[PDB]
Amino acid sequence: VNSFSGYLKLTDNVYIKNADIVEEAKKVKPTVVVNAANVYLKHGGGVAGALNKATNNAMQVESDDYIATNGPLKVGGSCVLSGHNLAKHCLHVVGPNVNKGEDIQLLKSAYENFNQHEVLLAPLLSAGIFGADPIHSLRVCVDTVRTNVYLAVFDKNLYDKLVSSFL
Ligand SMILES: O=C(O)c1cncc(O)c1
């Protein structure tokens, strides 16, 4: 049993809810929250900007030190950093950004990072301002992630469309 409440079960291991991931992280304090990161860990907008704002910019300060030491992530890659006041850990995952021309096939590689963690609170990778079709992102998630994933979809309209269209 875990602390996640009000989710809709899609599969054996994937659950979904209409929720602000920031508000959900603050309530649950999950072991892992996933950030919709870019390779530079520049948390300017969407999930990353909202998560970073909720940490009072401590996520960005930590991220800048990580990049100064290690250089940029790969598209499809990830790193584990602090979850600050939101979670134990933040798994920063880089899905491909369609608005930068990145290979959508990298979305499966991005989701494979989730399999290193038994339970996660996450957004749909490459959705929102990353430009991918969220229906596609949910299908790749279900077909890739084997660990237990609790998806927080920000848009009520989109949430209802994801549920209604789910095969
Ligand atoms: O994860 C989301 O629900 C999301 C919704 N809108 C914009 C965005 O970048 C992400």
UniProtKB/Swiss-Prot annotation:
**SUBUNIT field:** May form homohexamers. Interacts with N protein.
Q: Classify the protein's membrane topology as the record does.
A: Multi-pass membrane protein
Tell me which domain of life the UniProt entry assigns to the organism this sequence originates from.
Viruses
Q: What's the encoding gene here?
A: rep
Please identify the protein, giving its name as recorded.
Answer: Papain-like protease nsp3
The places in or outside the cell where this protein is found are: Host endoplasmic reticulum membrane
Q: Which reaction does it catalyse?
A: Thiol-dependent hydrolysis of ester, thioester, amide, peptide and isopeptide bonds formed by the C-terminal Gly of ubiquitin (a 76-residue protein attached to proteins as an intracellular targeting signal)
Species name: Severe acute respiratory syndrome coronavirus 2 (2019-nCoV)
Macro domain location is 1-167
**Tell me, what controls this protein's activity?**
Inhibited in vitro by GRL-0617.
Any idea what job this protein has? Responsible for the cleavages located at the N-terminus of the replicase polyprotein. Participates together with nsp4 in the assembly of virally-induced cytoplasmic double-membrane vesicles necessary for viral replication. Antagonizes innate immune induction of type I interferon by blocking the phosphorylation, dimerization and subsequent nuclear translocation of host IRF3. Also prevents host NF-kappa-B signaling. In addition, PL-PRO possesses a deubiquitinating/deISGylating activity and processes both 'Lys-48'- and 'Lys-63'-linked polyubiquitin chains from cellular substrates.
